Amino acid sequence: LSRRYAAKSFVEWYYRQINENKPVASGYVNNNATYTKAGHPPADITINGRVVATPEEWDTMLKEQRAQHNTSSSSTLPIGRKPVRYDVDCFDVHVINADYRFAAPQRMIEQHAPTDGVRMMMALTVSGSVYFGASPRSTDDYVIKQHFNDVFILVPNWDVLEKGRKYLIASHKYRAY
């Protein structure tokens, strides 16, 4: 399915960035000029029930999470452990609007019909686990394990689709426990 491919590609990118200690801010509408000129509001971001103003702050919170679980200065804890690792279990995607038109160049509207599976606004739900202090590939030797849920609203990246990320985050709700 076209929506599964799009979602799969985003999911793989997004959590790879986090696991490689790289910023995800470039995946949000905030940092796309085409959307910005068209007057799109900043991404709605909620982290464990708290509103976060910018994706850059979310990136900072992820750094802080690593620091919080960085026990490398310990002389007794087992060596070769990674502070934080995100594992995706599965995801679900639902097309909210198959004829999404915000900031769309007119050619893109004409070129892609609502049935072509390109101009989609998608609701993406991701389920997985967060491992703290675990070996790089272990799901058993963690010090702490969380379950997390991510809910994204994705919109088409016109810049890329007419030629980076083919879809951008317009909304993000994160919950981990």
Numbering used by the authors: 2 to 164, 170 to 183
What does the paper say about this structure?
The Mex67–Mtr2 complex (NXF1–NXT1 in metazoans and small bristles in Drosophila melanogastor) is the principal mRNA-export factor in Sacccharomyces cerevisiae. Mtr2 is a ∼15–20 kDa protein that also has an NTF2-like fold and forms a tight heterodimeric complex with the Mex67 NTF2L domain.
In the complex, ctMtr2 was not altered when compared with the isolated structure, with a Cα r.m.s.d. of 0.38 Å over 148 residues.
